């Protein structure tokens with residue numbers, strides 16, 4: 001059976017109390033889809049009639065930390081189950097508080113210079129995220145009591161852009177985003 | 187009724 005594909009709409013980073021749909025694309029004619037969450041059965045969809053369906057939607061009306069974590073799906077044709085989809089990380093954001101983002105040496109640098117970002121949030125855990133706007137798949141994770149560092153190394157113009165950081169209350173439960181810091185590389 | 191935080195507009199995930 002083709003491997004199913006799993007994604008979140010509109011996005012996998014969902015503010016608290018906002019909605020998300022988890023989509024699972026299987027195969028036309030598949031008769032049962034399961035959505036798994038962290039090793040448990042979260043929901044089942046049984047397409048009726050199945051011959052017109054290759055994907056199923058699971059709606060979450062009000063996002064919270066108990067529904068944040070890893071999801072996967074599988075589907076069935078006759079007695080045979082597909083292999084699982086890749087894992088979807090569904091993350092709740094805007095939890096509790098707002099961190100401060102800083103940068104060394106500063107926001108304006110020349111190509112070649114080493115840049116470090118710093119994310120501080122005293123009321124959170126030791127795990128922090130650095131997010132370049134536009135590039136959620138390249139989110140960097142850092143570890144530190146009170147604050148974490150994110151060394152970029154020697155930068156080029158590829159590193160130019162707008163950054164925000166998050167503190168975390170668990171792996172999938174993140175703070176409000178920091179105010180943005182623009183990195184200018186000349 | 188689609189909601190999206192401004193910082194996620196044009197994010198690569200939406201594909």
Ligand SMILES: *CCC(=O)N1CN(C(=O)CC*)CN(C(=O)CC*)C1
Nearest residue numbers: 010188189190192194195196197200
């Ligand atoms: C919920 C709205 C939505 O997902 N899209 C419309 N749109 C904006 O609202 C701008 C933020 C553009 N979209 C994207 O930015 C996809 C990430 C799609």
